[PDB]
């Protein structure tokens, strides 16, 4: 006879904003027209008109309805504009019932595709923050009891608003400047991360290529890769500052100390360490960074032991889980030994023989920039800064800052990374993913009182000091002014 069923009341997905309340993802009303074939089978004369008004072809339409003649349920079309929802309801065709639904809209579109991600066909997070805070954002559906035609038991609770760490103004600046860089250098891909060194907040994350999450018809997986969180690479010279941090915490090294790197090579039994530039004998510790001397950093590493270097790299988060619970986040690899031989010691010190993400590197540069105090990474607005872990002594961190300032400013330095108005600090490198090439720059500013850490990755520009550095310069200048950071020069 008659029958009692239940249909679930969809929940309104929580609003996602940038840190200033700029909407980044919004649940917009749509309508999903369904039908009762049993009843539809009674109004076959109306089908061509229905069909046309569903874009569906006349005969393909009717084939469908006939095939499913017995089924009392079938969707016709998911999520139309509520107004086309009338275009069909204006035909009042028997067997045609309708659900009220939400579809996501992304006002900033491609600018913040990866960080925000997108929902699937069921209004479920499938990428980015949409997946990562799916529970917080997805409400709790309600339930209605339906009298099967031959009271609401609990009404739906709405999802909660989420304010991200992203500053949409710095995001636009980063998106633009990394797009321009890729075209000028004719590169395949790239990431740029901007981090608040005090709060752990990700102020900007951008990858190229990007996509419009509002129109994913011709989506490609290369476009959807959140590179900053999933591409792992050997950081090269960009981790030498952590090697130097251990040098200075050893008791055995100070910045004015000299190393002889003549003749730009060093035999390690069978191995040969080889410098990218071999026009040096005596270098101070700053010189070792300015020249990116692998012989220099290797000799210091032999003197202090790999353990001390490995320990700093671990404490600043390299090859460690970020705790950001994003979907396909790669952890990379900070490999350990009982007995570190010379080759493994040297390759760690000059930043081959580990793998890191752009996010991890920026996090580590944040720690150093924050006078050696690690703060947990956040993709949500931080209101109450958690207590940091003091992973490098303030004094060592201060010393390494000044050295990195000289890397950018000193003669022979990475002059294309200077930020006009401010003193900036950082280090270029030439990473490996065969073995792929990326140009890196990693830095923070202002050098004497840091606020912002930044990493730039540029995949196969068809050097870090030549390619990534000028992007760091342009984007840092803008970030600092957008954040009303006072010039320190």
Swiss-Prot record:
InterPro entries: Bact_Transpept/Beta-Lactamase (IPR050515), Beta-lactam/transpept-like (IPR012338), FtsI_transpept (IPR037532), PBP_dimer (IPR005311), PBP_dimer_sf (IPR036138), PCN-bd_Tpept (IPR001460). One of its GO terms (cellular component) is plasma membrane. It is found in: Cell inner membrane. It comes from the Bacteria. It is a single-pass membrane protein. One of its GO terms (molecular function) is penicillin binding. Its EC number is 3.4.16.4. Its main location: membrane. The keyword Transmembrane helix applies. Catalyzes cross-linking of the peptidoglycan cell wall at the division septum. Binds penicillin. This is Peptidoglycan D,D-transpeptidase FtsI. It comes from Pseudomonas aeruginosa (strain ATCC 15692 / DSM 22644 / CIP 104116 / JCM 14847 / LMG 12228 / 1C / PRS 101 / PAO1). The gene is ftsI.
């Amino acid at each position: 006879a008659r029958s009692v069923r239940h249909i679930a009341i969809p929940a309104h997905r929580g609003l996602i904003t940038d840190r200033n309340g700029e909407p980044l993802a919004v649940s917009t009303p749509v309508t999903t027209l369904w039908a009762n074939p049993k009843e539809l089978m009674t109004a076959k004369e109306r089908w061509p008109q229905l069909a046309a008004a569903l874009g569906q072809d006349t005969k393909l339409f009717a084939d469908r309805i006939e095939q499913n003649a017995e089924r009392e349920f079938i969707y016709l079309v998911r999520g139309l504009t509520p107004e086309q929802g009338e275009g069909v309801i204006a035909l009042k065709v028997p067997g045609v019932y309708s659900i009220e639904e939400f579809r996501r809209f992304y006002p900033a579109g491609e600018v913040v595709a990866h960080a925000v991600g997108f929902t699937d066909v069921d209004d479920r997070g499938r990428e980015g923050i949409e997946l990562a805070f799916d529970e917080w954002l997805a409400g709790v559906p309600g339930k209605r009891q339906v009298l099967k035609d031959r009271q609401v038991t609990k009404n739906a609770k709405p999802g909660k608003t989420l304010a991200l760490s992203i500053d949409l103004r710095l995001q636009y600046l980063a998106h633009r400047e990394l797009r321009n860089a890729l075209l000028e250098n004719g590169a395949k891909a790239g990431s740029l991360v901007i981090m608040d060194v005090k709060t752990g907040e990700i102020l900007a994350m951008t990858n190229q290529p990007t996509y419009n999450p509002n129109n994913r018809r011709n989506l490609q997986p290369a476009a959807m890769r959140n590179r900053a969180m999933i591409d792992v690479f050997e950081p090269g010279s960009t981790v030498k500052p952590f090697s130097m941090s251990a040098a200075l915490a050893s008791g055995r090294w100070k910045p004015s100390d000299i190393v002889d790197v003549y003749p730009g090579t060093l035999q390690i039994g069978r191995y040969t360490i080889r410098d990218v530039s071999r026009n040096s004998r005596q270098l101070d510790l700053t010189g070792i960074l300015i020249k990116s001397s692998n012989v220099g950093i290797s000799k210091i590493a032999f003197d202090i032991g790999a353990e001390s270097i490995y320990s700093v790299m671990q404490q600043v988060g390299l090859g460690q889980d970020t705790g950001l619970g994003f979907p396909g986040e790669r952890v990379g690899n900070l490999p350990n030994h009982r007995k570190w031989p010379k080759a493994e010691t040297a390759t760690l010190a000059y930043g081959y023989g580990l793998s890191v993400t752009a996010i991890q590197l920026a996090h580590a540069y944040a720690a150093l920039a924050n006078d050696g105090k690690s703060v947990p990474l956040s993709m949500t607005r931080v209101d109450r800064v958690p207590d940091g872990v003091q992973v490098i002594s303030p004094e060592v961190a201060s010393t390494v800052q000044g050295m990195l300032q000289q890397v950018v400013e000193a003669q022979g330095g990475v002059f294309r990374a200077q930020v006009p108005g401010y003193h900036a600090a950082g280090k270029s490198g030439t990473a490996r993913k065969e073995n792929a090439y990326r140009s890196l720059f990693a830095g923070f500013a202002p050098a004497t009182d840091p606020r912002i850490a930044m990493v730039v990755v540029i995949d196969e520009p068809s050097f870090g000091g030549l390619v990534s550095a000028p992007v760091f310069s342009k984007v840092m200048a803008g970030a600092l002014r957008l954040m009303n950071v006072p010039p320190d020069n």
